[PDB]
Amino acid sequence: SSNDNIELVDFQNIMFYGDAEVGDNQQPFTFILDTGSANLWVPSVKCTTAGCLTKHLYDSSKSRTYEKDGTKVEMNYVSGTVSGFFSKDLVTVGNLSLPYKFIEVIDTNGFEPTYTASTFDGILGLGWKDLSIGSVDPIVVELKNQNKIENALFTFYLPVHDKHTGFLTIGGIEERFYEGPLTYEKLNHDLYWQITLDAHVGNIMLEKANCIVDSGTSAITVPTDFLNKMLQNLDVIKVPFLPFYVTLCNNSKLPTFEFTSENGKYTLEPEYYLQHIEDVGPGLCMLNIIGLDFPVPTFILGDPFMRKYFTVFDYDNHSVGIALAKKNL
Ligand SMILES: CCCN(CCC)C(=O)c1cc(C(=O)N/C(=C\c2ccccc2)[C@H](O)CNC(C)(C)c2cccc(OC)c2)cc(N2CCCCC2)c1
Numbered sequence: 001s002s003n004d005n006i007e008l009v010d011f012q013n014i015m016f017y018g019d020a021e022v023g024d025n026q027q028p029f030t031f032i033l034d035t036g037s038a039n040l041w042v043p044s045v046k047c048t049t050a051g052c053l054t055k056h057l058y059d060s061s062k063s064r065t066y067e068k069d070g071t072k073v074e075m076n077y078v079s080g081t082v083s084g085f086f087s088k089d090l091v092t093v094g095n096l097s098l099p100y101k102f103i104e105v106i107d108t109n110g111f112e113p114t115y116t117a118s119t120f121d122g123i124l125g126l127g128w129k130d131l132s133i134g135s136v137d138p139i140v141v142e143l144k145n146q147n148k149i150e151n152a153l154f155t156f157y158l159p160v161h162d163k164h165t166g167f168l169t170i171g172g173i174e175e176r177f178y179e180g181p182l183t184y185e186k187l188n189h190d191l192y193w194q195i196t197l198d199a200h201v202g203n204i205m206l207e208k209a210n211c212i213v214d215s216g217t218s219a220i221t222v223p224t225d226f227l228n229k230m231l232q233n234l235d236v237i238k239v240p241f242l243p244f245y246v247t248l249c250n251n252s253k254l255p256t257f258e259f260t261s262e263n264g265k266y267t268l269e270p271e272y273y274l275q276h277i278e279d280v281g282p283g284l285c286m287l288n289i290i291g292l293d294f295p296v297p298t299f300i301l302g303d304p305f306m307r308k309y310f311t312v313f314d315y316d317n318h319s320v321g322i323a324l325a326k327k328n329l
Helices: 139-145 224-231 303-308
Strands: 004-011 015-022 027-034 040-043 067-076 081-093 096-107 122-125 153-157 166-170 178-190 193-201 204-213 220-222 236-238 245-248 257-260 265-268 274-278 284-287 289-291 298-301 309-314 319-325
Touching (some): 067 096, 178 309, 193 319, 220 224
Parallel strands (some): 040 096
Antiparallel strands (some): 004 166, 015 027, 015 081, 081 096, 220 298
């Protein structure tokens, strides 16, 4: 195809990963491909933490195209912190490469045990420029500016456990990934891939909610008050002292998420947010839903939403395209 494709690998049906390389000798890494952030980083050989020793590491000395920056930098994620300095080298994604600014992480201890538990080496942000630390132009925009792709856009077709692999496609929209109408939602900020949707779940309704499409989050998140009201009398159980909700797997009262705009309507059935714990009798399940409050009431449409819906991230048109993902390729 005319486009750039990076294969997405499924990992336990909740997170997915893809590979990319740094250096002219193309040192390989496994990344969370993250529309929810906007910085690229890789752990350095100069990182000597226990976590780093389990990872693929970046050695600048083995790359002839490496150029020094050294500006100190600290990334603060919700989970925790990685710190290091900026560096510039050739970044290769699929069959395209470009000189790019990224973070060499030298310290990983403030990001444990998350980092060691996970199978990524680093994170490759895919958000907008103002979301990045150090104001780094997004890779896809740069690739567009350099006429290495036709459009400044990328698309996610998520993998499903041994049924099909997935693709991050850079440069154009491929009809093989979706069926039915492809609908566009204008961004309400050039920051996250964030759009405005009315959110209906059951008895509760929130008009014009902020919805962030986030491939770097494996849950759906919901405002805490909304989540409370959502589950009342639904035979869902809050686990004491933990943030988890648990239910019988055959619970017919489990509601379907409904997100609507003037342009389209998207729904998410229990099938996409039920996690099976033990399939004894009626079955014990856990909701893949997290209560979480932002200054503005916000839904985070993470991987479960994207597993049902093929999504298009269009820099040129400042919008998110949504369509029903094909069940198989
Ligand atoms: C199921 C286990 C896998 N996992 C964490 C282990 C790697 C997650 O999917 C996860 C990812 C993020 C996260 O920050 N994702 C991002 C990057 C990332 C960083 C480190 C590891 C993995 C991914 C995104 O960049 C964050 N996106 C934004 C900024 C919009 C955001 C902000 C605030 C909360 C949030 O999570 C929904 C997402 C946050 C969380 N939460 C949300 C509930 C409370 C506990 C922490 C979970």
